[PDB]
Design a protein around this nucleic acid. Structure first.
Lengths: 117, 200, 239, 192, 205, 205, 117
RNA sequence: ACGAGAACACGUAUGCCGAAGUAUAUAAA
């Protein structure tokens, strides 16, 4: 897939990144995603427990909070389809798709970090 | 065990052709014959003293000596040089030495059986290699045999692997550098193979 | 038997008296079919002898080690008894070849027996894993030409011994080597070690003769339940 | 009089070590590929089939050293790498021999003296040929029962040295039995 | 003459380092590139610990002499009375169940734990790195036992029971005292593969 | 030789930071991706303390040649002496009770702790981020004791209980000086897993 | 592309290598490469798993991240044509070419390890 | 009716032993 790859090169303008996105501005999101990663990894079955569903709900709430806090994060989340992807992940309730999302978002962050001021 | 066989290369002509057109009497060929005979029937006895070798069948132009591996090589080199002295570098010797295990039927080992080898292989490469292993311990037959494993397969990826192995060793930069430079060259690497095989 | 390489066939050196080194020819054993008439007529030079010898890589020799643990190593502390065997291996395009002649019926029978034999061995330790073969019958024009000449001398290509009543006139002018041929026998009496053929001498496979002799299948038999045969019949090459 | 041919391939399940050089392994002095001698197959098979019990041992392999003479009725040949194992190892770039480092522990001292023993690679395949000279019609069933039991034993045993230490386990696959001389049927004889 | 096959799996509790290659890598098959446990390791550790169980005096230690029945089980055939070995220990190979497991859950087959050394009078550290086989790995083993003497089967399997039980409370490989290489045996099996001997009364825990 | 087992639990009092794998991560397994305390760490720490309790001259320190009785307890086999270790330490593994407890109270396993340095006559900070194992977690351990001789077992376990006390009032891990690494010991259990020795009079605090 | 394997000797300047590259800084890359080398080697067919394709995507992700963390690694990766060859290997999806890349990368690593401060 | 015919390069032992991923590094504004 790696739409992250060509998207990150689509967002290099004149230089600002996503209108000035920086790696310090995604720390909380990275932490939350990492904790959900380790918790889901600890899980055995593929069916997502209702508690992990509530974790996903709070994760969605946190994306929305951060996107309301800053404009560049809002543009990043909007164009990278984070919100639609999270909605679909919540709909599917499958662990493997959540791990695939984790890998995608990690790739996004890695590209954003490799292209910086 | 070691076994050595040698033949004078220019002996049929020497007996027969001899010195042309002016020294071809009975007397002068007779004295030449006596000289070769006495050489192979005294000088061997004296030359072999410092060597752990027993003399089996020697005379005419046949040299048949058997003993320890290392000793046979050293004595063969000594005899070749001492012969070139006595023949004033006019007559050459061809010789073969092989490694034969103990308790083989000697009838079978017999039917199996210079400046280059002395100067290039024994004197330079062997000496630097022996010093290298003497200075740095833990280089047992395992390390040497991995060197062989890389060398005998003549491939460039193996050259990179050998570079990695020498890097992981703890030899002095001079030793490693010399080994790697030799390893890059076909003649040198064959000579290096022979020398390190002799080390073992 | 006479060896071959990829497309070259070989016959032994005639022990013929060539008048010139006397060194380069001595180290030579076999002369291929291409240059054989050249050898017989002096058209071979010393450098050519060196070259032919150089090309003669048609197999290599080896000793394989083995041990025998049928001894008291089965029973109690007792040393193993290592023994050695001698082997020869041919490169992927070498082998040996025959020359046979007789009636057509005899050759048909020989074909049947050879088919039987290809899955048995032709050597020593057959039962231990040495010496099976596959055979092919090919008609080489040049070897046929060499075999079907007409001359005054004769080159003995096999091992023969004249009968009693022809040897005196057989050995008039000849150059030859004799070989003590010995060996044991298979299923004659109780003890193999106590049965051993009487030694037999026959001319070698390169001797040269003036007067032809026919041979005979000579018994080397004694103290046995059946006759044991040795072969002595020449295959002559007439040039 | 017919000659039965028993052909197949054997896999090296765990590393193999015949080691006639020692500690090298037996090879061919030009091809530099390892082989498994017929003498090894025959010796281990004879020891097993005899220890299982004699006259049958004399019958299959032949002794002819005890005041009576019996000719060998089973001929065993060497084995060699198949084309398949060679091509597979070449493509996947796998060397033909592994070298295991070993070690020994002294008691009251606990100093370790190491060893270096060469071993044929796992998964290698050897192609073999046996021959059965049927000199008696009325005994082929019995003799292939014996050779069956022998191969069954060898399946569960080792070839070469150090088998107690964990190497030499082999397997037999793809055995076919054909009659190559004579007019004896062999469509009922069976070997795993 | 019968032969009895012993089968099961070895489950790695804590990381294992056989590592005969010497950085400091583990032994690996050259056809699968996966770690193996050489059978010499099993035989030697069973030898050593079950020897140290019974009498093992300083004279016995110096001349490598051992107990008569451990010698019977593992064979000596050096001097005195030759006893041919009787238990054949094979190697152990990385099982396909755990291969599917770790492939599916994306877990490495080897960890490289980094270790340190604090020397004294200097307190200067010099690092090192060691490869170790991941826990939860499962290796498949086979033993073969030969019945050279019928009446001795019970005692021999009793002793090999001792061997298994004692090994479960010890280590394989190196760094055993540093935490490494504790194993357990699980899903054992006994079956007569050749012969006419019953193997129902047999057990190995 | 009989083997006496020691089992128990490490309670994490304040943070614990091994971090052999390294922003600056800690050592973690790969089958569960949950942290561990490597056994080498425990063994080295106890050896250092128990050596320091006995005599220690600059020469003992010069070449890690230590007092004879600690040497006996942990093995040297270097100075021409026959000494294999008598005490085996394994690794410690995130326990099940901890996992369940943190799951049903919704608390993470690792804290990410930010640290700074204030430069002298500069008053400028350079930040650091250090990740440490969360408090109150428990890891379980198992030790193995070998009885090479009968008449040093009581004395050796006296030494071990002294060492455990010293650890209970010391730090294990990185930078206890800067704050993290105090531990405690609970639920000591003593069994003789293989052998015929009694484990009733023997105790460790 | 073997000039890309012996560029390592052309990059011994004055003395630091690759501007201060150390193999120690290549450890995560080496670990991942070994992991998927083993996994590919056990595989039967030439056609790679789609999950293996995603794995290769994860390789590129990690390569970019490492190039972001350290500048010497960045130079090593950029000038030796690592990124294009990774993309190309992803493009052909054949096992033998993946092994070819593995041999090239291992040769790089070992030869670089020959020279270190 | 082949210088043959009997004949396991076998048996004993492992990668071991001591090593802490440590030392500083006001969570300033």
């Amino acid at each position: 897939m790696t739409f992250a790859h060509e998207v990150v090169k689509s967002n290099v303008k004149n230089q600002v990144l996503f209108n000035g996105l920086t790696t310090s501005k995604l720390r909380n999101l990275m932490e939350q995603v990492n904790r959900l990663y380790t918790i889901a990894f600890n899980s055995n079955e593929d069916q997502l427990n209702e508690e992990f569903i509530d974790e996903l709900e709070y994760l969605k709430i946190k994306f929305y909070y951060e996107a309301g806090r800053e404009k560049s994060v809002d543009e990043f989340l909007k164009k990278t389809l984070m919100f639609p992807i999270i909605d679909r992940v919540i709909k599917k309730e499958s662990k493997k798709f959540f791990l695939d999302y984790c890998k995608y978002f990690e790739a996004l962050v890695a590209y954003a970090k490799y292209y910086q001021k | 065990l070691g076994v050595v066989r040698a033949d004078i290369d220019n002996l049929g002509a020497t007996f027969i052709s001899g010195i042309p057109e002016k020294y071809n009497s009975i007397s002068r060929t007779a004295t030449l014959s006596r000289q070769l005979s006495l050489f192979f029937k005294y000088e061997l006895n004296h030359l072999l003293e410092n060597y752990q070798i027993t003399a089996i069948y020697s005379g005419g132009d046949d040299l048949f000596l058997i003993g320890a591996w290392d000793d046979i090589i050293e004595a063969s080199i000594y005899i070749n040089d001492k012969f070139k002295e006595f023949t004033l570098d006019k007559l050459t010797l061809s010789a073969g030495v092989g490694m034969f295990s103990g308790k083989y039927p000697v009838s079978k080992m017999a039917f199996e059986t210079w400046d280059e080898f002395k100067k290039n292989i024994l004197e330079e490469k062997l000496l630097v290699l022996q010093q290298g292993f003497s200075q740095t311990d833990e280089h047992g037959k395992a390390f040497i045999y991995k060197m062989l494993a890389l060398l005998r397969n003549n491939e460039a990826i193996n050259i990179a692997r050998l570079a990695y192995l020498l890097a992981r060793s703890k030899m002095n930069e001079d030793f490693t550098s010399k080994i790697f430079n030799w390893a890059q060259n076909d003649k040198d690497k064959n000579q290096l193979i022979t020398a390190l095989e002799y080390y073992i | 038997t006479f060896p071959y390489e990829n497309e070259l066939y070989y016959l032994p050196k005639p022990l013929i008296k060539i008048d010139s080194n006397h060194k380069a020819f001595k180290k030579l054993k076999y002369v291929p079919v291409h240059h054989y008439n050249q050898y017989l007529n002096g058209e071979l030079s010393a450098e050519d002898a060196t070259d032919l010898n150089d090309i003669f890589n048609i197999g290599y020799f080896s000793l394989q080690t083995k041990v025998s643990l049928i001894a008291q190593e089965t029973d109690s502390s007792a040393d193993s008894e290592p023994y050695s065997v001698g082997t020869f291996t041919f490169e992927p395009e070498a082998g040996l070849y025959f020359i046979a002649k007789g009636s057509e019926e005899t050759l048909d029978h020989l074909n049947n027996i050879m088919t039987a034999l290809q899955y048995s061995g032709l050597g020593g330790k057959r039962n231990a894993g040495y010496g099976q073969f596959e055979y092919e019958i090919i008609n080489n024009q040049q070897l046929s030409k060499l075999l079907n000449q007409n001359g005054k001398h004769s080159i003995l290509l096999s091992t023969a011994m004249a009968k009693k009543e022809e040897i005196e006139s057989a050995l008039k002018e000849a150059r030859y080597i004799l070989t003590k041929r010995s060996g044991f026998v298979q299923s004659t009496n109780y003890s193999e070690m106590l049965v051993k053929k009487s030694d037999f001498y026959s001319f070698s496979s390169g001797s040269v003769f003036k007067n032809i002799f026919n041979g005979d299948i000579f018994n080397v038999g004694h103290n046995g339940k059946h006759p044991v045969y040795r072969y002595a019949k020449p295959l002559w090459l007439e040039v | 009089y017919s000659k039965i041919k028993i052909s197949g391939t054997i896999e090296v399940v765990t590393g193999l070590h015949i080691g006639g050089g020692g500690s090298p392994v037996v090879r061919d002095l030009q091809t530099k590929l390892p082989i498994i001698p017929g003498s090894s197959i025959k010796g281990k098979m004879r020891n097993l089939l005899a220890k299982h019990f004699d006259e049958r041992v004399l019958r299959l392999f032949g002794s002819s050293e005890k005041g009576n003479i019996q000719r060998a009725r089973l001929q065993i040949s060497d084995a060699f790498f198949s084309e398949k194992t060679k091509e597979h190892f070449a493509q996947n770039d796998i060397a033909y021999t592994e070298t295991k480092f070993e070690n020994t522990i002294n008691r009251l001292t606990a100093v370790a003296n190491p060893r270096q023993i060469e071993r044929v690679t796992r998964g290698s395949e050897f192609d073999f040929v046996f021959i059965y000279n049927v000199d008696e019609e009325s005994q082929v069933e019995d003799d292939f029962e014996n050779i069956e039991k022998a191969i069954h034993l060898l399946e569960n045993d080792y070839l070469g040295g150090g088998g107690t230490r964990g190497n030499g386990r082999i397997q037999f696959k793809d055995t076919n039995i054909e009659t190559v001389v004579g007019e004896y049927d062999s469509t009922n004889l069976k070997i795993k």
